[PDB]
Ligand binder design. Structure first.
Ligand SMILES: Nc1ncnc2c1ncn2[C@@H]1O[C@H](COP(=O)(O)OP(=O)(O)OP(=O)(O)O)[C@@H](O)[C@H]1O
Ligand SMILES: Nc1ncnc2c1ncn2[C@@H]1O[C@H](COP(=O)(O)OP(=O)(O)O)[C@@H](O)[C@H]1O
Ligand SMILES: [Mg+2]
Ligand SMILES: [Mg+2]
Lengths: 52, 506, 174, 74, 464, 463, 52, 73
């Protein structure tokens, strides 16, 4: 019984993180959508050319 | 609370720190989790294959211009043209003692839903057998908690021994008991579910945790509904995890359940590759297909251990014991796949339908059940006390067989029949009824001493149990001493017969 | 497959054209004949149960007009003799690949979120010459599908830098 | 769809591109194509008979029984 | 574009090309643009071309005709209004009761329950049929194959089962008719109609004459029905349990063999669909008891070639939780239900499972009956006189057991006016164990005919 | 010159070659990356041919480079190979250092000429009643143990090696073919306990090995023995050669494994069509010639315990000494379980075996034949309702069966009873005395699991 | 008893989920990390990202 | 009454197709609200012919060289 209780506790404490990650990544990707930076594109492609 | 926030932040600051050079091949053709992919040339035979769906694949056919491969899981979310990359790395699986008390995906993913577990070691699944110059003779016992089994059919550490029977005749319950026996021994024990009903699964589980055995124990499952690929591959993985401890000079134990399903599933899969079949739709390699897996279990040298761990050990001989399962249709021992597997195993056990139907649980057809190793693992007590009793009762069987259409019986046949009846009744136990060594020891002593050919037929088992009580009450130090050793001394049997007379007086 | 059966003809034609130097003429004719192949109308007219090898050979010369040779004449002839006309365009593609590798020039597929300026283009061409082709071949592509970065494709040599990274890391999250 | 013939060696193909005459030296001698398990496929010698004996560059002998469109199995 | 046109068809096979940007995944719905024929996505032939089988006829159709997609598998309505209606494979009205009012539909090809969803316990499913209650007790999420010939009211049996499940526990019932002998199906409809049981069950038949694909898929159809119904949960959670009767899954196997031939791939060892085991598991493991709620299934089955070594029953036994057989002579003896009591077996026959005392009583009863069969032959050949006295007692008491097994039914109640018999466990066992004492040897065997509880038996003895 | 990998299926490989350089059909092809090696089998032509691999098929991609040796598989040969443990490549596995000699010999060779066979006319006494009675041997003959899976094919061989080895003095060779590793290692250690370990050489090609390795495994040892027979003693010839085959059925099985991948067709069951010719090729390089004597023992697993399988059928056309096992005899607990009837010997000649031997044997088989025939009716009817002479013959035959049951010197491992070696004279006299009915008053138990007739007397008077 | 604690724990998790919605919108800054730091900062300006 | 003949010497196709025709004519009078009866002869040979056709139609072989559609038919 104690093992089942603590397993449920840990289960919930891990379960929360999944939806947390889902919401966080959705918000972050939306923020990346709102920004429109071709200059950053150019800078990073120059960096890539360096990295090749 | 915020601890998860810090953890996810640092895990985000961890990786994906740069681009990557890689190669892709897109889908061409699809059928039943079997796909045709073109565009990957750097591929490896049977490597892990990357897919946008998050699943993976194992490579099958390296032709001139594309590849056919196999799914790992369902595929209904897949379609031609999607992206499909290559890991450039062979099939593996996490392995570690952390697996204990856990049941997971056939790819080591926790189906228990008790949190993912990291295994600091991960190993390729497909591996080859060790070298002959590293093998060690089997010398160490394995106890099955039985009288019938442990005595007449010895099984030592590292031996492979098939169990064969019919449906609902007692095939698993036996292995389960054997595992529970190993509780005190502390040996490595691990079992694989292969294409059976999840109800049966959870039953086994609940029994295990009831025993608390599922703490030195690990099991992985291949569900009967899972696409055949996992069924095909899983036993190899289970062997891989098992070999970890044998690779550490540590004796090990595996239990294969229902290789028949895996066999037929592979037959189907390979035939879907339009490859021509042999007898009854089975291709030839099936013998090899199973046997190669079976050879991976053996008792090895400490020298092999040192060659494996190159200083990480002092050197002790390791081993891994094998418990495979094959069912027989209508008791056809001569069936093709049985004929194949018996040619592989170091021995076999078969269970008789009628005796279980006659209530004899278990129900051994000792007639054909033998071990190549035999008396190399039994205790000197057991080994000396046994030796021909299984043969004696086997001949008693055929005597009774001949004794039903002939009215003449000499005193030799008479004594053989009457003693065979007593010894037959002597080989009964209850489900979940293990035995200490002295149990069967005193039982067989009484039998050989004719101490049973004297008492009531039905009362045999009652006398037996009450004898166990009588002794383990009065003679508890005696049996403690004898079972802690496994050695016999004559004064010990003097005490045994003293107890015999005292209990027969009661 | 189709490509596998095409294999020998591609290398044979490449060997012959290189041996003659009409590789250009061959290749251009291949583009034309491929176009003819994909043409449903021309193919259907070709696929009528009336044509003899000479028929379709003369037809292909006609639709070919000039840029003809007795060499390609026999080539097409024997192709029809084995009736391997359908997989013609794949032979052309493989032949193009053969010339490229024979000349070590490679092509790169460039896909971006924004239009790209030339200076970037020769910059990255040079950068990829560190992967040492003989000659870079540029195929640019602008995609609001992409948000950041440019993914590249050298045959199957592919490198991502775009938004997809979030998808990968988010897989990593779970 | 038709599959490969035992006659599609790019050597032969390039020869055909070069010329369409001198048929196998009037089919007086063939050339080895496919070899496996005492069975050999050869290009040319269409003049020969099913059941006609055949000599070989190895100074050996053999018996073709298959006169295909363009190949022969021996 | 969101549709394709017909490019080739052979037999029951249909092929259509699409563009590379729009091509459906497997099992999604495909409506022939121009008629009511529907196509099921099966495997991607590449080149925009995909292979499918049509639901319904194959004529009226020619190449080049456009056909569209829904990009989703078959979705059929789910709801309480589904009861009392008979539907096609596509869940379209065939009782002419108008279109189904419920537009709430659900996809069919869906995944088997999770390991976590495996109901953590097992417990005895109950009913009012004493021989079932004792000799072959069931469990929720149970799977029992039925055996027998014809002429025993199999339908009637099911009717009583449905009545009891709807009465005692309000458990819902659905039936699927696979390879229905149309006349028999109509007759069965009228039979379940006169009985008001009609309202408590959902009906779809797959007539064997139909294209084998829809005949195949009606199984999953009813399966999804039951899934929704059980998952349909009342207040406090814990929705009711549901019951499913499946018409001769053997026919389903035959249809699978057919369609296996139809794709033109390898015919198996005995000759079957090689993937048969997988779709078995698809059926079975999708059916069980859940953590909250259960669905139990009872399935008709015929044994081809009367053999138990051919693959179909072998695979079948991997899931039959119990065995129930019907004996003709038993009906000939006017014994009802005409179930052969001695030989029908349940896996759920352990004192661990059925209860210790229950197990012992059952074991003794079967022992007695076994003895009686060993005896009646010697009786007939040698007269009842030549037996030992206890042998005669066993004879009489076992015949009393058989008579006691005879019982009217609430379905029989409307058939012939007579109060039906409802009896639970631990109600039979009391009378049975009392009979094991021989305390009714004075009671005539006739006092056990067409009777319920032992109290009723003694009341009959009083009036007799 | 070198080749490149273009396709990988299973364990069969194909490679591209320069038009100038196309290696012969049998050559070693070294993976230029690994130690993996290849043998050619088919001239697929157009600069491409087909091959198989020896060793792991993994770590292998397409386009990777491979060289040719311009030399077929030629392996080290000579007495410097004795007391050593080699791979399928004839390379040490015992880790006792590299072999000493430098002579190599190709594994492939044509069969010896008709003008070279020898009249193996030398008998042998072994100590096993059924064998020395029913199957006289020719020193130099082929000895096959027809038997199913778990009938005692290995055991029957171990005991013979014991007896044969101890009765012999000279060359001997063993080659493990596709079998359990454990049994092989155990045998190796047992031999190490002996000293003819030196006299013999070890090589194991085991079931674990890839089928490509599994195929050309016998070639090694058979070529070894062929040399040693042709390796003439100074002022003399080759010596008596001890050869021991371990489930040639494994080789057959591998040929089945590869045929479909070879572009080949499926026999009437699925075997390679070429199975008969390859078996004959294999067998023909095995013979005692004008030069030297080669004694060969064959382990013959029987698939599904069936004789009518094509492979055993072909096998009989190869074996002068045929020994067959049964499952039912073992089901009776009789160890060994060799069937008297089908196991036969062409050495069974009255001018050879002596008149009494011949006639006694014939009478024995006759008795057993009637008993087997009447088994049907006696199963149907009561044993009592039969003619008295019939019943007498029944008991005679049953006691004969028991009198065959013998303990073996290694068999005491699963029993404990000490094994026996019964001189043929005792056997003959005892069987004749039984056939004389001198013992019809003797309980049948007195004959079970015994050796000589005097042992029977002791057992009976004891009983 | 485990129910009595688990539903109230969930009730706490509702306050926690709004909390961590805010906290993860704050944590959504890590797309800058996903970038090459192409944007050193881009998010704190727009704060409409607030859901659940 | 009426009889339609598919003689053994007839090409297999008409033999294969006749039973359905006779069925249709019977259904006529079933559709005429009245009753009648039909007799089906040598269905085995009918299946034989249909199998032969299917074979000549390159159709995939079935058990006993019978594609399963026969039972459907
Ligand atoms: N010693 C025993 N005494 C009585 N019953 C036993 C004994 N051992 C096992 N059984 C019973 O045998 C029954 C059938 O065996 P079980 O269901 O556990 O697995 P199985 O024989 O492998 O069959 P399956 O094919 O379903 O996997 C079990 O219900 C168990 O209770
Ligand atoms: N000589 C014997 N007498 C009695 N029993 C034997 C004898 N030899 C073997 N057995 C038993 O029979 C089993 C099978 O023997 P084995 O020769 O290994 O069979 P296989 O043909 O499969 O190699 C042995 O493991 C042993 O237990
Ligand atoms: Mg089981
Ligand atoms: Mg063997």
């Amino acid at each position: 019984a104690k093992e089942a209780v603590d397993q449920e506790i840990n289960s919930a404490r891990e379960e929360l993180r999944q939806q947390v990650a889902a919401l966080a990544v959705t918000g972050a990707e939306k923020i990346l959508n709102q920004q429109v930076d071709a200059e950053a594109h150019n800078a990073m492609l120059s960096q890539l050319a360096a990295k090749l | 609370p915020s601890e998860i926030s810090a953890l996810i932040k640092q895990r985000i600051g961890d990786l994906d720190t740069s681009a990557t050079a890689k190669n892709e091949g897109t889908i061409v053709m699809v059928s039943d989790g079997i796909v045709r992919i073109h565009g990957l040339a750097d591929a490896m035979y049977g490597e892990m294959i990357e897919f946008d769906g998050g699943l993976f694949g194992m490579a099958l056919n390296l032709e001139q211009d594309s590849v056919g491969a196999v799914v790992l899981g369902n595929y209904l979310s897949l379609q031609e043209g999607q992206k499909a990359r290559c890991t450039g790395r062979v099939l593996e699986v996490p392995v570690g003692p952390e697996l204990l008390g856990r049941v997971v995906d056939a790819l080591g993913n926790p189906i228990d839903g008790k949190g993912p577990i990291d295994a600091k070691l991960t190993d390729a699944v497909e591996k080859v057998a060790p070298g002959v110059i590293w093998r060690q003779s089997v010398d160490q016992p394995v106890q099955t908690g039985y009288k019938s089994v442990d005595t007449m059919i010895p099984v030592g550490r590292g031996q492979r021994e098939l169990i064969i029977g019919d449906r609902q005749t007692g095939k698993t319950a036996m292995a389960i008991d054997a595992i529970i026996a190993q509780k005190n021994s502390g040996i490595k024990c691990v079992y694989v579910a292969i294409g059976q009903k999840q109800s049966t699964i959870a039953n086994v589980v609940r029994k295990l945790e009831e025993t608390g055995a599922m703490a030195y124990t690990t099991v992985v499952a291949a569900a009967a509904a899972d696409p055949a690929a996992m069924q095909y591959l899983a036993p190899y993985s289970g062997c891989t995890m098992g070999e970890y401890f044998r690779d550490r000079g540590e004796d090990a134990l595996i239990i294969y359940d229902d290789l028949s399903k895996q066999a037929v599933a592979y037959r189907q899969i390979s035939l879907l590759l339009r490859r021509p079949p042999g007898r009854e739709a089975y291709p030839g390699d099936v013998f090899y297909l199973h046997s190669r897996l079976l050879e991976r279990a053996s008792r090895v040298s400490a020298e092999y251990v040192e060659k494996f761990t190159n200083g990480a050990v002092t050197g002790k001989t390791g081993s891994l014991t094998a418990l495979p399962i094959i069912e027989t249709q209508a008791g056809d021992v001569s069936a093709f796949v049985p004929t194949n597997v018996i040619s592989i195993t170091d021995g076999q056990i078969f269970l008789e339908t009628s005796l279980f139907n006659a209530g004899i649980r278990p129900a051994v057809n000792a007639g054909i059940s033998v071990s190549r190793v035999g008396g190399s693992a039994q205790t000197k007590i057991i080994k000396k006390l046994s030796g021909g009793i299984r043969t004696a009762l086997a001949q008693y069987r055929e005597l009774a067989a001949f004794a039903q259409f002939a009215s003449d019986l000499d005193e030799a046949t008479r004594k053989q029949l009457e003693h065979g009846q007593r010894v037959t009744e002597l080989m009964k136990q209850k489900q979940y009824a293990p035995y200490s060594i002295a149990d069967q020891a005193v039982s067989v002593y009484a039998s050989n001493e004719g101490y049973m050919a004297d008492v009531e037929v039905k009362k045999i088992v009652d006398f037996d149990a009450a004898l166990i009580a009588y002794f383990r009450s009065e003679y508890a130090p005696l049996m403690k001493q004898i079972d802690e050793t496994g050695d016999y001394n004559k004064d010990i049997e003097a005490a045994i017969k003293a107890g015999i007379e005292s209990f027969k007086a009661t | 497959e189709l490509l596998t059966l095409a294999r020998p003809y591609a290398k044979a034609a490449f060997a012959y054209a290189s041996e003659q130097g009409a590789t250009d003429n061959w290749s251009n004719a291949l583009q034309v004949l491929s176009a003819a192949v994909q043409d449903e109308a021309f193919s259907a007219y070709l696929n009528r149960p009336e044509l003899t090898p000479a028929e379709q050979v003369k037809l292909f010369a006609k639709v070919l007009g000039e840029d003809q040779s007795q060499a390609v004449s026999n080539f097409l002839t024997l192709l029809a003799d084995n009736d391997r006309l359908v997989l013609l365009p794949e032979i052309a593609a493989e032949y193009e690949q053969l010339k490229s590798q024979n000349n070590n020039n490679v092509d790169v597929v460039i896909e971006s979120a924004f239009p790209l300026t030339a200076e970037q283009e020769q910059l990255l061409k040079s950068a990829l010459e560190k992967r040492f082709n003989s000659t870079v071949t540029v195929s640019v592509e602008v995609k609001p599908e992409l948000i950041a970065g440019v993914v590249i494709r050298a045959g199957d040599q592919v490198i991502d830098d775009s938004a997809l990274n979030k998808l990968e890391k988010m897989r990593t999250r779970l | 769809m038709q599959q490969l013939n035992p006659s599609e060696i790019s050597a032969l193909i390039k020869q055909r591109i070069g010329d369409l005459d001198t048929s196998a030296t009037a089919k007086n001698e063939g050339t080895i194509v496919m070899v496996s398990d005492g069975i050999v496929r050869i290009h040319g010698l269409a003049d020969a008979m099913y059941g006609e004996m055949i000599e070989f560059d190895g100074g050996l002998f053999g018996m073709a029984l298959n006169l295909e469109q363009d190949s022969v199995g021996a | 574009m969101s549709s394709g046109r017909i490019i080739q068809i052979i037999g029951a096979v249909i092929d259509v090309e699409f563009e590379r940007t729009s091509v459906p995944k497997i099992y999604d719905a495909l409506q022939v643009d121009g008629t009511e024929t529907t196509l099921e996505v099966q495997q991607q032939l590449g080149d925009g071309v995909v292979r499918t089988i049509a639901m319904g006829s194959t004529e009226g159709l020619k190449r080049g005709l456009t056909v569209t997609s829904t990009n989703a598998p078959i979705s059929v309505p789910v709801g309480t209004a589904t009861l009392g209606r008979i539907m096609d494979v596509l869940g379209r009205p065939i009782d002419e009761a108008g279109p189904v009012a419920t537009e709430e539909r659900l996809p069919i090809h869906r995944q088997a329950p999770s390991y976590a969803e495996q109901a953590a316990s097992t417990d005895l499913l109950e009913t009012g049929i004493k021989v079932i209650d004792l000799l072959c007790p069931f469990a929720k999420g149970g799977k029992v194959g039925l055996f027998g010939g014809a002429g025993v009211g199999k339908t009637v049996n099911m009717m009583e089962l449905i009545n009891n499940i709807a009465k005692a526990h309000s458990g819902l019932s659905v039936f699927a008719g696979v390879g229905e002998r149309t006349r028999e199906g109509n007759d069965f409809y009228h039979e379940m109609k006169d009985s008001n049981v009609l309202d408590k069950v959902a009906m779809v038949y797959g007539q064997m004459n139909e294209p084998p694909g829809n005949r195949l898929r009606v199984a999953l159809t009813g399966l999804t029905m039951a899934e929704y119904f059980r998952d349909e949960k009342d207040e406090n959670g814990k929705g009711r349990d549901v019951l499913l009767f499946v018409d001769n899954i053997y026919r389903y196997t035959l249809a699978g063999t057919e369609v296996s031939a139809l794709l033109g791939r390898m015919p198996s060892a005995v000759g079957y669909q090689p993937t048969l085991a997988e779709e078995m598991g698809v059926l079975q493991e999708r059916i069980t008891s859940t953590k909250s709620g259960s669905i139990t299934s009872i399935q008709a089955v015929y044994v081809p070639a009367d053999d138990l070594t051919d693959p179909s029953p072998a695979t079948t036994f991997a899931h039959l939780d119990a065995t129930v057989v019907l004996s003709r002579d038993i009906a000939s003896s006017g014994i009802y239900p005409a179930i052969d009591p001695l030989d029908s077996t349940s896996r759920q026959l352990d004192p661990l499972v059925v209860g210790q005392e229950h197990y012992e009583i059952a074991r003794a009863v079967q022992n007695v009956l076994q003895r009686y069969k060993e005896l009646k032959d010697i009786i007939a050949i040698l007269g009842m006189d030549e037996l030992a006295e206890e042998d005669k007692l066993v004879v009489y008491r076992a015949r009393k057991i058989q008579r006691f097994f005879s019982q009217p039914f609430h379905v029989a109640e409307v058939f012939t006016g007579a109060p039906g018999k409802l009896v639970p466990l631990k109600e039979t066992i009391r009378g049975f164990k009392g009979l094991l004492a021989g305390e009714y040897d004075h009671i005539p065997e006739q006092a056990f005919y067409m009777v319920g509880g032992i109290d009723e038996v003694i009341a009959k003895a009083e009036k007799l």
